[PDB]
Design a protein around this ligand. Structure first.
Ligand code: NA
Length: 129
């Protein structure tokens, strides 16, 4: 599924991501924009052999099982394929664990480099939330 900006903002809010660990909804929508362009089916291979999956590009090195990331963990206890579903429940549930790990949303390199410190409220502008 390719989400609309406000469609994804509504979905993230419903699933309790708005101001989760003190990160406003616009930070999450900004992260999703630059990680996946709001595409639930987005996959990208990392240099270390791990893969990033779904709207928030959750890494198989720590968070989900893809069977091909030697020495990796599955801290979200899910198959990485569950992170590509049109239903973002699994991605949001796993994102809550990531953002709670100690470095907040710095875990998302694209959030740090492209969203952090910017006018993230622009990402929910005009949305009926
Ligand atoms: Na893994």
């Amino acid at each position: 599924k390719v989400f609309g900006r406000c469609e994804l903002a509504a979905a993230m809010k419903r699933h309790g991501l708005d101001n989760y660990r003190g990160y406003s909804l616009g930070n999450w929508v900004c992260a999703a924009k630059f990680e996946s362009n709001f595409n639930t089916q987005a996959t990208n291979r990392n240099t270390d052999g791990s893969t990033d999956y779904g709207i928030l590009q959750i890494n198989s090195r720590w968070w989900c099982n893809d069977g091909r990331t030697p020495g990796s963990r599955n801290l979200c206890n899910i198959p990485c394929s569950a992170l590509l579903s049109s239903d973002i429940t699994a991605s949001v549930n796993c994102a809550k664990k990531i953002v709670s790990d100690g470095n907040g949303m710095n875990a998302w390199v694209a959030w740090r480099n492209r969203c952090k410190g910017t006018d993230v409220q622009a990402w929910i502008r005009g949305c009926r939330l």
